[PDB]
Design a protein around this ligand. Structure first.
Ligand SMILES: Nc1nc2c(ncn2[C@@H]2O[C@H](COP(=O)(O)O[C@H]3[C@@H](O)[C@H](n4ccc(=O)[nH]c4=O)O[C@@H]3CO)[C@H]3CC(O)(O)C[C@H]32)c(=O)[nH]1
Ligand SMILES: [Cl-]
Ligand code: NA
Length: 396
């Protein structure tokens, strides 16, 4: 008997069912979402939220587009900020303050990102930040301090790769990893409102990663998550989502560390990319389904729900009230990694909120990064190609 089974029974006895389409495939994120929905459904009479896994986030956005063409949308779904911009073109989303959900106390980093034309269209729910994961044992073995600067981080990667005979900074050749280096070399994606993928800082960021591969300190991870590759070869560092935390803990045969990101100087951590999702509410939903969603959104923003979800997963608590919750404070008192995730969350940058950004980040930018890293494409050539494909897509 698992939470998916409890929910099936809850929804069988409900007159009103609000479907919540998500991209959690398993692990602690899926279990923590199901536990929240079980607790919510217990407090209802004749109403329930039914979580529906749609595969990953890419599959979820595909399924939502198909659902619009079919006229069969769920009540709620997870959405990135760019997915919100796309659904607003279709006038598909209900303004959250029209349901009367109170948003006071939501982190303005997250709430500003869901505001379009001054109107809030999503509820931050599962919001992640990049952190520096590291191998405490391996850095201890060689007396290497946790690097606080990008210059320190490259030096440490070089030193430890030479010592252990293989590349110890592991990375996915993807848009998320590129964003870390790009933003911390002073990059910006929007130049006077135009999307630019081929700026000098983009070229510098991709060149830094390609050079790290060539110099023997950076290891491209081509199959699976970094946490699914641990155990083969020496590992010192990765720059990866906070929502990876439980996956790294389950996989690591070494003592896992979590640090803030290396920055240009010791005066501030590096910026991390904010990922994970908001909850949106579809206009097509019934008034009765929308009233379940209102309740469910006030519940997800409650300090206890945030405290339990964040401590279960490594997601960033999205409210001030969550950090004052005793369950959150008890976990943080025993495990400094929670406070590290919160500190890092203060130094946060977003990708562009363009309707076309999901296609661009994977199929255009992500492909240019893979060409340069995996096929030794010249960085500037690869990003020049990415710029022209993005401009053609944005024109079309
Ligand atoms: N569709 C679409 N996806 C986007 C967009 N912007 C960014 N991303 C993706 O957000 C993932 C980060 O979201 P986050 O919720 O922080 O982390 C996820 C999982 O990544 C992570 N996970 C799962 C299994 C595992 O072994 N290890 C692990 O870390 O846990 C969470 C739940 O699955 C990145 C990863 C990516 O999927 O490859 C592409 C990136 C967008 O605009 N659209
Ligand atoms: Cl080994
Ligand atoms: Na393994």
């Amino acid at each position: 008997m698992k939470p998916e089974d409890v929910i099936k029974e809850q929804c069988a006895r409900a007159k009103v069912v609000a479907e919540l389409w998500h991209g959690f495939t398993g692990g602690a994120p899926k279990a923590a979402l199901e536990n929240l929905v079980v607790e919510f459904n217990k407090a209802q009479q004749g109403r329930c939220v039914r979580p529906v896994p749609q595969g990953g986030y890419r599959d979820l956005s595909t399924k939502i587009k198909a659902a619009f063409a079919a006229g069969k949308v769920p009540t709620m779904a997870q959405a990135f900020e760019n997915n919100i911009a796309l659904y607003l073109e279709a006038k598909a989303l209900l303004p959250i303050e029209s349901l009367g959900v109170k948003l006071q106390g939501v982190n303005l980093t997250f709430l500003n990102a869901v505001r379009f034309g001054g109107v809030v269209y999503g509820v931050p729910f599962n919001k992640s930040i990049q952190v520096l994961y590291y191998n405490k044992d391996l850095l201890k073995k060689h007396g290497v301090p946790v690097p606080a600067t990008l210059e320190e981080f490259v030096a440490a990667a070089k030193k430890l790769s030479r010592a252990e005979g293989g590349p110890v900074y592991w990375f996915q050749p993807d848009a998320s990893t590129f964003a870390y280096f790009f933003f911390n070399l002073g990059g910006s994606y929007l130049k006077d409102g135009k999307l630019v993928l081929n700026s000098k800082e983009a070229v510098e960021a991709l060149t830094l990663l390609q050079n790290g591969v060539k110099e023997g300190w950076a290891k491209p991870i081509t199959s699976g998550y970094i946490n699914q590759n641990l155990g083969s070869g020496p590992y010192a560092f990765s720059v990866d989502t906070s929502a990876g935390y439980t996956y790294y803990l389950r996989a690591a045969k070494f003592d896992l560390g979590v640090a803030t990101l290396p920055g240009r100087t010791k005066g501030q951590p590096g910026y991390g990319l904010v990922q994970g999702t908001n909850l949106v509410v579809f206009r097509q939903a019934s008034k009765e389904e929308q009233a379940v969603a209102k309740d469910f959104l006030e519940f997800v923003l409650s300090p206890r729900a945030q405290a339990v979800f964040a401590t279960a997963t490594g997601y960033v608590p999205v409210t001030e009230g969550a950090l004052k919750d005793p369950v959150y404070q008890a976990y943080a008192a025993e495990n400094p990694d929670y406070a590290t995730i919160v500190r890092q969350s203060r130094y946060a940058k977003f990708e562009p909120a363009l309707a076309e950004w999901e296609q661009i980040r994977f199929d255009i930018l992500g492909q240019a990064i893979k060409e340069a890293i995996l096929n030794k494409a010249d960085p500037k050539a690869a990003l020049d190609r990415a710029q022209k494909l993005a401009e053609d897509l944005l024109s079309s």
